[PDB]
Scaffold this active site. Structure first.
Site, PDB file in Angstrom:
ATOM      1  N   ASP A 172       0.861  -1.138  -0.125  1.00 39.30           N
ATOM      2  CA  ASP A 172      -0.025  -0.099  -0.109  1.00 39.30           C
ATOM      3  C   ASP A 172       0.993   1.128  -0.029  1.00 39.30           C
ATOM      4  O   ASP A 172       0.443   2.140   0.772  1.00 39.30           O
ATOM      5  CB  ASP A 172      -0.888  -0.006   1.143  1.00 39.30           C
ATOM      6  CG  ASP A 172      -1.751  -1.233   1.249  1.00 39.30           C
ATOM      7  OD1 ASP A 172      -2.309  -1.502   0.299  1.00 39.30           O
ATOM      8  OD2 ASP A 172      -1.701  -1.990   2.435  1.00 39.30           O
ATOM      9  N   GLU A 223     -11.245   0.574  -3.749  1.00 38.04           N
ATOM     10  CA  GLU A 223     -10.650   1.087  -2.557  1.00 38.04           C
ATOM     11  C   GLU A 223      -9.286   1.880  -3.073  1.00 38.04           C
ATOM     12  O   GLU A 223      -9.269   2.286  -4.172  1.00 38.04           O
ATOM     13  CB  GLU A 223     -10.392  -0.095  -1.625  1.00 38.04           C
ATOM     14  CG  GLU A 223      -9.311  -1.130  -2.363  1.00 38.04           C
ATOM     15  CD  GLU A 223      -9.128  -2.491  -1.311  1.00 38.04           C
ATOM     16  OE1 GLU A 223     -10.010  -2.551  -0.484  1.00 38.04           O
ATOM     17  OE2 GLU A 223      -8.597  -3.290  -1.952  1.00 38.04           O
TER      18      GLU A 223
END
Ligand SMILES: [Ca+2]
Ligand SMILES: [Ca+2]
Lengths: 504, 504
Positions: free
Chosen positions: A14, A177
């Site tokens: 991420d 997302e």
């Protein structure tokens, strides 16, 4: 010139990136590991130096009950007018928060908790009109429609201004997302991940003249994915874009390097880099028409690993992480100068709530990891050694212990519901060197009698039984030093003189 | 009216379908299991009755050295002028062949070996000009470009006519495969699978005016996939189309029902059904715009599970399979009438080459499986019981055995390189009932003393450690009856009185 993906190897998922002048900073998710949110610096997007962590104090990082399925999820790093903002979710608490810094060599602020902002993957965008937008996922607790939500935010107050609005549902992939809002050449671009962070992972983009939409889907979505390929890099996405100071555009994102069949990965999700080209009609395309490779052209980026810790400093190196918030009293660099002294508790590697453990990421498929341990267990429960650790149900250890009055070196495994002692040999001295040789398919566990230099192979274990696919959660393997009393406090101290990580 | 997917539950992959009048026949891949290539009959596409197997003789099915990674891969079934043709690959031999039948209640022919036809997923198409085409994948042994290859075939000779030609590379997904050629409303359609038979699986289609192309990719490819979704059905593809006798069109294909996170499946790839609509501009679309569900509308299809084997017949039921070609002398239904008598050999469940084992597929997440065993082991190596079996490195067993002169009921597991005896209880009689309760996450292993009816839970095991993702290969879990002498021939016979499979 070329560079290799991943640019940050091992468990570094991420990635979020932030440019300040000709310096670049990047952060990754850390789940149950302490300290939290590693932060890296680069001047060329390829070579990253870890400068520390963003969450280092209990007030910033509450990991009680956190596991490799929970704790700190994706972070986003932004910079505005001399202040850095790190925004993330502690999923164990189900809370989003921000910490701030004006000096990256110092610690970050106390958290500002964003009340009534749910979901994961919070992101910030500073618009030219002085407005700041927070963007994130649907909140499952509220039964929200799946998609990307946004509001204006007051950063001082930690409060939302006006209404939380669904701005885009994505292209129809699962788990829309990782949203980031940008403004480029008069368009607002909303960049997201779809498909889940596994073999379906992809990056999609939409755009609008207005920050709240309506958003038009890019006609060649997805703009990055290895879904339905057998490429060595898989599960690619969760991207954040940067304009390098020469004007060229780049994305950082993560991907995995699975092995075996079906594919299984044990090094976590690893940070990768790819160029962006902007189409004549105003859409970004990442890499080679939406795919990437292990070797990539560096464009005009200026192109440019053995780690040995002797425990000589009273400050832990930035390689080391603990499982949740550590019980600081059980680790000492001062009790025996130049050694790490650890006190095992009742908690074992099978327990989630901070066993005595310190570990570092496996960042290479082929490496040799070793430590010298002094340990004289006083009672049968007492145990200290070197672990290859995925989570509380997936870990292998080579250790000194005591059984029926006798000291034994043992190889132990936990895999799911199976807990086994694989081999046991009597051992006749107070110090031992443990070594693990990793290759893609197996770990080989050996010990050396320090006094003779004689090595003995105690046994082996499969990498695939520690893979994320097998173990669950969101993380990569660590190599750790640990001690435990197996249901009682460990009365013998464990002293580790050094730790070596030697990649091939 | 509705029906549920899967229409054929449990390990039934790579379905190929063939209509003869108002009857429908379907075949699936069987890998290392004997007999090979189950064949089913239906009149409504929803409800299938297994009528037997296509490969039942050693001359048709050579499975020495076959594993759940090898043996028989996708079969295709076709019918022309009163003859059925079953074409498939024995991947252990790296050979493609055909068997034929004019009577499905009888056995099929000896194989016709197709020399110089490599790859997997061979298929046949009978054109209106009398030509027959064989279509298949690239041959890795020859370093062929990835894609779909075709030639004319002479079915009598088992020989290719003219040249083997690459006809389509697919859309760019990995492993372009499962090719079937059809002719519908003046177009040739080439239907294939891409992305691999895992989470990337999809169905794509191309068309041409000519059987060898050039083929135009469908502009809305893929026409069926659950990639990048979190649907309960995953890995969907390997389709074959049928026109039902009311004129409506349907596809059969497979998919999985994974559980846990990351997704893991243990029931194999299961056969599913979906309708086809033809677009105004001449392309097929499967299901609900390229997706499907557990509950589906049946259109005008005419809509309409406890299995107990008492071993009363001297013919094995069609539920039973062996691991590779069985040593027939080690199984007897005549030695003790109304029982199955098995002779364990030196081979164990950890060995690939036909241990003494007979098993049936797990076809439900929730079921109870039991057997009554008479077994008096004469020596310490001797063992017989009930197994939950994925492959030679992934299986759990509850069994009677002998150790140091004493008879013990044991729970044993093999998971990868770990072999463990989980629990052991002394047992004091010659007969025992073993029972396994399966639920989605775990198997619970119990035994009953037949003389009292008292049940005892011996232990439990995770479904996920037997999943395909963990274990490897291409198959689903079986429940089996087995015996072994653990490196010697087993001197005690094992007698099983019955077997029950009771789904929830
Ligand atoms: Ca030292
Ligand atoms: Ca019977």
């Amino acid at each position: 010139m070329e560079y290799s993906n991943p640019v940050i190897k091992g468990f570094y998922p991420d990635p979020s990136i932030c440019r300040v002048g000709s310096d670049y900073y990047l952060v990754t998710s850390s789940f149950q590991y302490f300290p939290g949110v590693p932060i890296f610096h680069s001047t060329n997007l390829i070579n990253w130096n870890k400068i520390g962590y963003c969450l280092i104090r209990p007030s910033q990082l509450m990991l009680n009950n956190a596991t490799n399925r929970s704790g700190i999820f994706a972070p986003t790093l932004r910079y505005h007018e001399g202040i850095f903002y790190l925004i993330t979710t502690n999923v164990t608490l189900k809370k989003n928060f921000i910490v701030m810094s004006e000096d990256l060599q110092g610690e970050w602020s106390e958290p500002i908790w964003i009340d009534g902002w749910g979901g994961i993957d919070p992101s910030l965008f500073f618009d030219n009109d002085g407005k700041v937008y927070i963007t994130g996922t649907n909140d499952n607790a509220r039964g929200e429609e799946l998609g990307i939500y946004q509001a204006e935010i007051d950063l001082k107050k930690g409060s939302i201004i006006g209404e939380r609005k669904l701005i885009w549902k994505g292209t129809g992939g699962s788990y829309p997302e990782a949203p980031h809002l940008y403004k480029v050449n008069g368009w607002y671009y909303l960049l997201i991940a779809e498909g889940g962070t596994e073999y379906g992972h992809m990056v999609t983009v939409a755009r609008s003249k207005y920050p709240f939409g309506p958003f038009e889907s890019c006609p060649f979505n997805p703009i990055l994915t290895h879904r339905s390929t057998n490429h060595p890099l898989q599960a690619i996405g969760h991207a954040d874009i940067v304009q390098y100071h020469d004007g060229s555009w780049w994305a950082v994102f993560h991907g995995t390097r699975p092995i075996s069949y079906p594919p299984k990965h044990h090094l976590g999700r690893e940070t990768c880099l790819a160029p962006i080209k902007w189409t004549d009609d105003g859409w970004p395309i990442i890499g080679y028409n939406g795919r990437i490779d292990i070797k990539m052209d560096a464009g005009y980026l200026p192109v440019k690993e053995i780690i040995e810790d002797d425990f000589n400093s009273d400050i832990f190196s930035t390689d080391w992480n603990f499982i949740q918030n550590p019980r600081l009293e059980h680790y000492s660099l001062k009790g025996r100068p130049s050694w790490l002294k650890m006190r095992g508790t009742e908690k074992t590697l099978n327990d989630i709530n901070s066993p005595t453990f310190i570990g570092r990421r496996q960042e290479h498929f082929v490496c040799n990891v070793s430590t010298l341990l002094e340990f004289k267990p006083n009672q049968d429960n007492e145990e200290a050694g070197l672990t290859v650790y995925m989570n509380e149900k997936h870990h292998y250890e080579i250790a000194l212990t005591k059984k029926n009055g006798r000291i034994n070196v043992v190889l132990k495994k936990t895999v799911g519901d199976i807990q086994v002692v694989v081999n046991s040999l009597e051992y006749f001295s107070n110090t031992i060197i443990f070594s693990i040789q990793a290759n893609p398919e197996e770990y080989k566990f050996s010990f050396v009698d320090p006094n003779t230099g004689q090595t003995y192979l105690l046994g082996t274990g499969l990498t695939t039984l520690l893979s994320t696919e097998v173990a669950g959660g969101f993380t990569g393997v660590y190599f750790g030093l640990y001690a435990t009393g197996n249901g009682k406090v460990c009365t013998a101290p464990a002293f580790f003189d050094w730790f070596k990580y030697i990649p091939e």
